[PDB]
């Protein structure tokens, strides 16, 4: 899944 700070 996406990193904690992505998007």
């Amino acid at each position: 899944e996406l990193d904690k700070f992505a998007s």
Partner: antibody
Amino acid sequence: RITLKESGPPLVKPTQTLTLTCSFSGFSLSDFGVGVGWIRQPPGKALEWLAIIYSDDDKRYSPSLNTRLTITKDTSKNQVVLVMTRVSPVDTATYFCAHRRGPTTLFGVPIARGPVNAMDVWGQGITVTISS
Amino acid sequence: ALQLTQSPSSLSASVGDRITITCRASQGVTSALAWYRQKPGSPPQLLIYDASSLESGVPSRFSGSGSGTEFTLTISTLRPEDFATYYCQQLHFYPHTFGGGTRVDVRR
């Protein structure tokens, strides 16, 4: 100045449980968005990411090792512990813990996330050998 | 999962050369990529964070560029301490992958 240091047993036998401790200074795991991760390096091989834990207590693990890893923090002791169960010889490696910055804030307002993209300070690493 | 391929895996060079190491990702990782230099017997050391930002205290001969799926680290004037192994790391998707590393050794 941020420093981290790994501690635990240098030798462990197959099927046993390995508990590694990362003790650090210079930051608190209660600071905003900070993370502490674990990375390992079998002799002569590449770095391999294992897990990371943030100050808001979100935890993430390598999918390949998920079932054998537990990461936890002890904020008041400035330590992060990684527990690996059922080790086998292929787990022999040098294990490093490392700091991950949280976003930069201005008057307590997050304004830059670029600094989270790296593990910026590393511990010297602790060599662990798995053999019966 | 996401794959990070470094090139070349090994590279020979001499003091004063300009070298460039590249890292390609199987899916785009935006700018969430870091470069490290690791000398024998020591932990990796952060050189470049967020694809191109120079880490504090890191010498200016190190430079990083690229975003998406292709990144490059270039050392403009190789110094003796640069004979080492370099790694790139992606931090956009979990797990936070490392490339296979590229060994830089003394050419002869």
